[PDB]
Design an enzyme around this catalytic site. Structure first.
Site, PDB file in Angstrom:
ATOM      1  N   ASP A  25       0.541  -1.073  -0.001  1.00 17.89           N
ATOM      2  CA  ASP A  25       0.033  -0.016  -0.364  1.00 17.89           C
ATOM      3  C   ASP A  25       0.747   1.316   0.330  1.00 17.89           C
ATOM      4  OD1 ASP A  25      -2.231  -1.882   0.553  1.00 17.89           O
ATOM      5  OD2 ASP A  25      -2.406  -1.330   2.558  1.00 17.89           O
ATOM      6  N   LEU A  81     -10.944  -6.412  12.905  1.00 18.93           N
ATOM      7  CA  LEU A  81      -9.356  -6.394  13.380  1.00 18.93           C
ATOM      8  C   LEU A  81      -8.278  -5.851  12.335  1.00 18.93           C
ATOM      9  CD1 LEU A  81      -8.758 -10.287  14.330  1.00 18.93           C
ATOM     10  CD2 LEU A  81      -9.774  -8.182  16.123  1.00 18.93           C
ATOM     11  N   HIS A  84      -1.692  -5.907  15.689  1.00 17.93           N
ATOM     12  CA  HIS A  84      -1.660  -6.326  17.218  1.00 17.93           C
ATOM     13  C   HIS A  84      -1.015  -6.499  17.035  1.00 17.93           C
ATOM     14  CE1 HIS A  84      -2.629 -10.862  15.988  1.00 17.93           C
ATOM     15  NE2 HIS A  84      -1.356 -11.070  15.392  1.00 17.93           N
ATOM     16  N   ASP A  99      -2.638  -6.325   9.393  1.00 14.27           N
ATOM     17  CA  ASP A  99      -3.006  -7.034   8.583  1.00 14.27           C
ATOM     18  C   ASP A  99      -3.030  -5.794   7.292  1.00 14.27           C
ATOM     19  OD1 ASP A  99      -5.338  -8.385   7.077  1.00 14.27           O
ATOM     20  OD2 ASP A  99      -6.645  -8.026   8.561  1.00 14.27           O
ATOM     21  N   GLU A 102      -6.386  -4.903   5.634  1.00 15.40           N
ATOM     22  CA  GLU A 102      -6.757  -3.180   5.378  1.00 15.40           C
ATOM     23  C   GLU A 102      -5.559  -2.515   4.588  1.00 15.40           C
ATOM     24  OE1 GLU A 102      -8.569  -5.418   8.372  1.00 15.40           O
ATOM     25  OE2 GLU A 102      -9.022  -3.196   6.993  1.00 15.40           O
ATOM     26  N   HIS A 119      -0.133   3.158  18.204  1.00 13.88           N
ATOM     27  CA  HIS A 119      -0.791   3.027  19.392  1.00 13.88           C
ATOM     28  C   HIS A 119      -0.432   1.231  19.819  1.00 13.88           C
ATOM     29  CE1 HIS A 119      -4.692   1.059  21.034  1.00 13.88           C
ATOM     30  NE2 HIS A 119      -4.781   0.222  20.505  1.00 13.88           N
ATOM     31  N   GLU A 120       0.129   0.557  18.486  1.00 12.37           N
ATOM     32  CA  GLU A 120       0.375  -0.377  18.526  1.00 12.37           C
ATOM     33  C   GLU A 120       1.521  -0.613  19.233  1.00 12.37           C
ATOM     34  OE1 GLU A 120      -0.919  -3.109  18.322  1.00 12.37           O
ATOM     35  OE2 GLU A 120      -3.296  -2.281  17.509  1.00 12.37           O
ATOM     36  N   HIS A 123       0.922  -0.908  23.482  1.00 13.23           N
ATOM     37  CA  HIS A 123       1.238  -2.011  23.600  1.00 13.23           C
ATOM     38  C   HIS A 123       2.107  -2.837  23.990  1.00 13.23           C
ATOM     39  CE1 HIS A 123      -3.281  -1.830  23.793  1.00 13.23           C
ATOM     40  NE2 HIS A 123      -3.447  -2.262  22.363  1.00 13.23           N
ATOM     41  N   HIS A 129      -5.522  -1.124  27.108  1.00 17.19           N
ATOM     42  CA  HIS A 129      -5.621   0.305  26.986  1.00 17.19           C
ATOM     43  C   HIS A 129      -6.519   1.247  27.722  1.00 17.19           C
ATOM     44  CE1 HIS A 129      -8.133  -2.283  22.939  1.00 17.19           C
ATOM     45  NE2 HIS A 129      -6.554  -1.494  22.399  1.00 17.19           N
TER      46      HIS A 129
HETATM   47  C1  LIG Z   1      -8.738  -0.235  16.928  1.00 15.89           C
HETATM   48  C2  LIG Z   1      -7.178   0.141  18.609  1.00 15.89           C
HETATM   49  O1  LIG Z   1      -6.902   1.961  18.147  1.00 15.89           O
HETATM   50  C3  LIG Z   1      -6.358   2.528  17.183  1.00 15.89           C
HETATM   51  O2  LIG Z   1      -5.259   1.832  16.680  1.00 15.89           O
HETATM   52  C4  LIG Z   1      -5.806   3.654  17.699  1.00 15.89           C
HETATM   53  C5  LIG Z   1      -5.297   4.730  16.842  1.00 15.89           C
HETATM   54  C6  LIG Z   1      -5.595   5.677  17.405  1.00 15.89           C
HETATM   55  C7  LIG Z   1      -5.396   7.062  16.744  1.00 15.89           C
HETATM   56  C8  LIG Z   1      -5.834   8.178  18.202  1.00 15.89           C
HETATM   57  C9  LIG Z   1      -5.392   9.949  17.670  1.00 15.89           C
HETATM   58  N1  LIG Z   1      -5.258   9.851  16.093  1.00 15.89           N
HETATM   59  O3  LIG Z   1      -5.101   9.981  18.067  1.00 15.89           O
HETATM   60  C10 LIG Z   1      -6.324   7.920  18.831  1.00 15.89           C
HETATM   61  C11 LIG Z   1      -6.710   6.597  19.261  1.00 15.89           C
HETATM   62  C12 LIG Z   1      -6.499   5.834  18.395  1.00 15.89           C
HETATM   63  N2  LIG Z   1      -5.752   4.750  18.344  1.00 15.89           N
HETATM   64 CA   LIG Z   2      -3.446  -3.222   2.003  1.00 11.42          CA
HETATM   65 CA   LIG Z   3      -8.913  -6.759   9.231  1.00 11.23          CA
HETATM   66 ZN   LIG Z   4       0.014 -12.499  14.833  1.00  9.23          ZN
HETATM   67 ZN   LIG Z   5      -5.341  -1.224  21.093  1.00 12.25          ZN
END
Ligand SMILES: CCOC(=O)c1cc2cc(C(N)=O)ccc2[nH]1
Ligand SMILES: [Ca+2]
Ligand SMILES: [Ca+2]
Ligand SMILES: [Zn+2]
Ligand SMILES: [Zn+2]
Ligand SMILES: CCOC(=O)c1cc2cc(C(N)=O)ccc2[nH]1
Ligand SMILES: [Ca+2]
Ligand SMILES: [Ca+2]
Ligand SMILES: [Ca+2]
Ligand SMILES: [Ca+2]
Ligand SMILES: [Zn+2]
Ligand SMILES: [Zn+2]
Lengths: 166, 166
Positions: A25, A81, A84, A99, A102, A119-120, A123, A129
């Protein structure tokens, strides 16, 4: 007795990462820049340092995959999803998987890789979270449209509670 | 913000399980009774509650399989490995698999399903093996016409507390 001990945080401040493969991408350069920027989010507010390795094993192995991709946490095609990451630890610990069903982007046409990675990597470093709807660690993707990113205080406090300030 | 818990445990006290399939060796009722009693071993000494689901996705998915059955831990035919279970976590986390090349029983013959399951659910809840030869979480099978040994009580309560003490 014995429990399964969790590595609440990396024991070392100097961590390595490797981009194992690349999404169709975006250009190699865009992917590299997105991940570098995502790590800098966290290293800017802690003593953590991140260096990229091109070969062999690194603490945080980054890759793109689809469906079943080698860890029995399969992805699910487009939507749902997105990615992760494993909590700190040996082997798979710290690793981040994206993934490729996406659409990943350096802008807003799909999912912004920098933001999802940031974000990841949270983790990857020991954050769960957040319940704060404004936090980076809040579990909903959003894209602000602005060309600069400010790590919210909630995430600053979370990561610094593990590693301290820079 | 939230940091990842100190040790692998469930963040909720109410857990679900599902018996995905059944061994040829025992009636459905016998298998259901053994698993229900195995869960009660742990709920009796913690605040944990277990509810059975007949279909859909439960926290603790239970199945009988042979050889390769969908994870990195293939079974090995008769004898040797009998069963295994995954620590608390999403997806395969908490799940328990039993080798159906073994003879499962509700008696002293073969391998008593209740006893093996009681041990495996220890893992499902976050206990690893104990060095106490008399502990339920001791890795080697032994048959007893039950009372949960203190080592296991201390372990599981270190994770979830004691619940109602009387
Ligand atoms: C579904 C897992 O969550 C994220 O992948 C996730 C991306 C993200 C970006 C912002 C931001 N643009 O500040 C805030 C919170 C966020 N969470
Ligand atoms: Ca792709
Ligand atoms: Ca997916
Ligand atoms: Zn994996
Ligand atoms: Zn998360
Ligand atoms: C997968 C092998 O199953 C066990 O690992 C196992 C079962 C068991 C039963 C008792 C008991 N008789 O209470 C004690 C220790 C035990 N370990
Ligand atoms: Ca790793
Ligand atoms: Ca076997
Ligand atoms: Ca599960
Ligand atoms: Ca059998
Ligand atoms: Zn298995
Ligand atoms: Zn075991």
């Amino acid at each position: 007795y014995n429990v399964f001990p969790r590595t609440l945080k990396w024991s070392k401040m100097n961590l390595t990462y490797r981009i194992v493969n690349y999404t169709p991408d975006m250009t190699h350069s865009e992917v590299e820049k997105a991940f570098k920027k995502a790590f800098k989010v966290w290293s800017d507010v802690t003593p953590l340092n991140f260096t990229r390795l091109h070969d062999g094993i690194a603490d945080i192995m980054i890759s793109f995959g689809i469906k079943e991709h080698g860890d029995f946490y399969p992805f699910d095609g487009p939507s749902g999803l997105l990615a992760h990451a494993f909590p700190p630890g040996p082997n798979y610990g710290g690793d981040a998987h994206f993934d490729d069903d996406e659409t990943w982007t350096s802008s807003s046409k799909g999912y912004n890789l920098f933001l999802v990675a940031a974000h990841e990597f949270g983790h990857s470093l020991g954050l769960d979270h957040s319940k704060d709807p404004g936090a980076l660690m809040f579990p909903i993707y959003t894209y602000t449209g602005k060309s600069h990113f400010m790590l919210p205080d909630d995430d600053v406090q979370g990561i610094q509670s593990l590693y301290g300030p820079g």
